[PDB]
Amino acid sequence: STRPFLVAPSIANSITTEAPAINHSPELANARKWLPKRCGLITRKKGMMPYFDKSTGERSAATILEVNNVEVIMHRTSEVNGYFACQVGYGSRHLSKVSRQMLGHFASKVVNPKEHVAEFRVKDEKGLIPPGTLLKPSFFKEGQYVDVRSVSKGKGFTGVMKRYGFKGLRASHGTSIMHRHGGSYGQNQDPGRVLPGRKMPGHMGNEHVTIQNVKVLKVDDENNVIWVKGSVAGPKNSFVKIQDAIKKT
Amino acid sequence: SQVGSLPLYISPEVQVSINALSMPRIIRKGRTSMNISQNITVKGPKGELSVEVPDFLHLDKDEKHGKINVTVQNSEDKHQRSMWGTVRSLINNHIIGVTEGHLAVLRFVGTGYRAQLENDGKFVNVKVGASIKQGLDVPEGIVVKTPAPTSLIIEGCNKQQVLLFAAKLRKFHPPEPYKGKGIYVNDETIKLKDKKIK
Amino acid sequence: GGLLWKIPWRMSTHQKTRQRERLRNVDQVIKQLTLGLHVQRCQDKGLTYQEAMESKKKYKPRSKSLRLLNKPSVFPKENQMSSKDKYWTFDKKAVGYRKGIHKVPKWTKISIRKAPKFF
């Protein structure tokens, strides 16, 4: 019960006042952000096929996005994590491939070992979907607009001509060996150095890409596919995050 | 000092009281400063109103003859006696507001220029000419009435607010010197230019 | 233009105080020289040191340099000088016909006390 402790008069008599809100704080940042009011899906890009409108005959390319065992694993909240998000898991995996720690995690959350896990940030708590619920393609509406995020194809160590569209030099008129080079990469003694961000040859691709306002053309559950007008970043069998568009509806 | 030294005549139906607050707010300047912790309240038949006044200004009552005076400690301070004059003017204006009221008449000169009231008399719509609807909503303490589409009456108990709302409405279309066109706040007028086409 | 001789155009309080003390020191040197001459005159006439110092009549110097230095109109004492002439010296190539006394070479050794009446 009683223990020896001493109190400083300055602290004891200090008047209590509340510190003001600073912009560089999760609460204010979350208030400022531009986020959807609903959770999304994880899909696996399967490839592209034609889409023919039965009525007007329009033909448009469409990517096929597979929905396979998409379940909500757990939630994130403002009072515990600083933002509202739904962690979603896609697919089925094998014991041998999943680790013991993550096997315990999936067991605790009452889901099967998952191919992929990624979390979608919602605006508030109304958009959190209960854990363990299976999400189907019909989760989206025909003719609505979504945003798709995925890692794009790798192009390797790419030169300046391909990477940034430099014109290079002439193929004739005395041009010396350096045909496909970027030219000058700075100025004379005044800078005395190459400014940061100078465009130079280097690895291109394997980078995240967000494509906004992609139209959902067809949704069906008997095949477990979602049709997206246009193209999606990444090779085949690449994971894609689909979520309602923030700009158009 | 001449403005602030003029006394105030208060009718039996209007009363003025002065009190203090809990949080004195102290505003700063260069070598000078101000501290504000008092409040004056005017009550009358047409509602109630209030003003914030510093601690260096006091009100002397007189029930006989219904007379009240406003004075500060040190008139040697220019930055004090200016406030004394302004506070006298403000309290007097509030007294006029409560006893009688403040009114402003907007005239809409120009063909098709007219104003209407919508949303239970809260919104005012003006047609000074635009492909987009124009107007705004009245603030608290102001009431508007339209005897004619081409005329509008804005009145209340706070002179500053009534006239600021009038000016905000006028901002959409001030008078045009070539042909009289726009919103006229009061009896004030403009001088027109000759035609003298080239 | 090219070299940076970063000499500010106005002195500081400490510099002014040191200048005042230096002026006072020169005044003291002049005073002591005159007093020594007076005491020597008294001792030559016969008196001794004590009443040479206590003598009511003080002998004035007979040399041109000492007499002129003792005249206030030629070598004014520190307390007699003006604040302007304590710190600023006369120059005919400067705006205002003045320059800081600290821009004079070897200003802590050389002495300036008087400038033209109307400058």
Partner: protein, 162 residues
């Protein structure tokens, strides 16, 4: 002879509290005092090669005193190294972004010596805009001061810790 004895008390990092609500010094003057404390000049056992500084806790920084129009005019600079990237933020904006104590932290950092000990002396300063801090128990107190403090205040400072 004077040096021979128990130096453990001498080289002890005390914790000091400065309540800006009660303090009357302005930003720069308060910061100069804080820098002196952090360096440890106030200790007669100070030697330049050693870091004899103490901890400092500042509370109620939202009442700090700044003179003139510095709040709306003083600018803080930052440049990464790429030309055209000179961030200039007014004190008002820096306060709204990172708080009032950030200004004091910059002032103290400027007044500290430019050594390898600069950052470890700076991290020794704890600043809080409000009164709620986790170092209420980490403040020098003596048994002879407890008389003025009422019992419920002691119970609050003991049991209601963060």
């Amino acid at each position: 002879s004077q040096k021979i004895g128990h130096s453990g008390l001498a080289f002890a990092r005390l914790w000091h509290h400065v309540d800006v609500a009660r303090d009357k010094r302005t930003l720069g003057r308060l910061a100069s005092a804080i820098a002196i404390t952090l360096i440890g000049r106030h200790k007669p056992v100070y030697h330049p090669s050693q870091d004899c500084g103490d901890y400092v806790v500042v509370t109620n920084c939202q009442k700090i005193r700044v003179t003139g129009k510095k709040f709306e005019q003083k600018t803080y600079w930052s440049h990464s190294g790429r030309p055209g990237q000179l961030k200039l933020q007014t004190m008002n904006k820096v306060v709204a972004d990172k708080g009032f104590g950030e200004i004091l932290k910059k002032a103290v950092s400027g007044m500290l010596p430019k050594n390898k000990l600069r950052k470890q002396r700076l991290d020794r300063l704890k600043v809080f805009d409000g009164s709620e801090n986790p170092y209420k128990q980490n403040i020098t107190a003596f048994a002879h001061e407890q008389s003025s403090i009422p019992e419920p205040l002691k119970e609050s400072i003991f049991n209601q810790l963060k």
